[PDB]
Amino acid sequence: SDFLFKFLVIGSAGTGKSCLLHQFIEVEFGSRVVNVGGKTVKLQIWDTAGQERFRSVTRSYYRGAAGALLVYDITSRETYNSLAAWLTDARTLASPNIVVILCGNKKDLDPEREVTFLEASRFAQENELMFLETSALTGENVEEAFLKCARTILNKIDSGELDPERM
């Protein structure tokens, strides 16, 4: 493979993080080789193993990660309000250069929506994050979130924003 990246999927317990991973590959981790611009990027995506339901997430989970999905549940504002803390954790325990794509998950549960597309998209813009709404149940935008994250990493490598020899 031309690139090897450790990826996270972070956010509140119950937001669909493990289902996003399972949808993307098919669980402690998963790996999948994706083609971006004729280059194979091998992703090793670490699952939190439910630890965030019970305690702080171990810092060894974040360490060395190049990219992350930051996930909230569109039906739960409480998960949405938690995003800054997860993002700060990602940037402190992984690195300030982790590429993070915001995912409003459970898009298929639009009737019971509590977070608007537009307030979430403003959050992303304000925080230098790409944004998509996703469903792990149907699969809508799941592959694309992972692809967008990987694609952004390679663009920043290409433009000299990210030093690939330090990743």
Ligand X SMILES: Nc1nc2c(ncn2[C@@H]2O[C@H](COP(=O)(O)OP(=O)(O)O)[C@@H](O)[C@H]2O)c(=O)[nH]1
17 is in an annotated binding site: yes
* 2 labelled ligand-binding: no
Among the listed residues 3, 89, 135, 150, the single contact to ligand X using CB under 6 A: 135
Evaluate whether 73 touches 133 at the Cβ level (below 8 Å).
no
14 is in an annotated binding site: yes
Is 18 annotated among the ligand-binding residues? Answer: yes
Cβ contact 40:1 at 8 Å: yes
38: how many CB neighbours lie within 10 A of its CB?
A: 6
141 binds ligand X (CB under 6 A): no
Token pair for 56? 């702080």
The interface mask with Mg ion, positions 8-27, x = CB under 5 A, is: ---------xx---------
CB of 11 to Mg ion, least distance (A): 9
> Pick from 6, 7, 19, 93: which binds ligand X (CB under 6 A)?
19
Q: How far is CA 3 from CA 7, 36, 119, in A?
A: 12, 10, 34
Pick the stretch among 12-20, 61-69, 85-93, 117-125 that binds ligand X (CB under 6 A): 12-20
Smaller CB separation from Mg ion, 10 or 74:
10
Strand order in the sheet with 99-105: 29-36, 39-46, 3-11, 67-73, 99-105, 130-134
75 binds, among Mg ion, ligand X, none (CB under 5 to 8 A by kind): none
